[PDB]
UniProtKB/TrEMBL annotation:
CDD domains in alphabetical order: beta-trefoil_Ricin_MtaL
Protein name: Lectin-like fold protein
């Protein structure tokens, strides 16, 4: 089940976990998957209910996981229901989820970690692709 309202949540893909830094500053910072954290709790996330889906908050950076230009997933300082809402859907495999664009009709593009540090973008779901499989680890 989705760890709702749990501050210590790491967002996992294979051996990497999602990181995001505070904006120095319509601004935003890359969501980076890596096996190193760039400062205290830059790898710590808070998931809440938002309408028919979820919002994903980085406790380190105070940024919201959001769709940005070119289907890139960024942390953005300012919340926007249009860019910051996600569907989290069980994959069928252990505790693995797809984080998708909420779409009336379904078939929303999903978090895709590109095959060191790596960025996240939205692409069509391929059920078998481990680069779109997300796990949530608490503490």
């Amino acid at each position: 089940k989705i760890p709702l309202d749990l501050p210590g949540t790491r967002i996992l893909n294979g051996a990497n976990w999602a990181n995001n830094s505070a904006t120095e500053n319509n601004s935003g910072t890359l969501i980076i998957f890596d096996q190193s954290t760039p400062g205290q709790d830059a790898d710590r996330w808070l998931i809440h209910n938002y309408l028919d889906g979820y919002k994903i908050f980085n406790m380190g950076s105070n940024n919201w996981a959001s769709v940005s230009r070119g289907n890139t997933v960024l942390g953005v300082s300012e919340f926007d229901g249009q860019t910051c809402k996600w569907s989290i859907e069980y994959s069928g495999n252990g505790e693995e989820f797809w984080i998708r664009v909420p779409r009336e009709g379904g078939g929303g593009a999903v978090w895709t970690i590109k095959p060191g540090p790596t960025t996240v973008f939205l692409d069509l779901l391929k059920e078998t692709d481990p680069n779109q499989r997300i796990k949530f680890a608490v503490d």
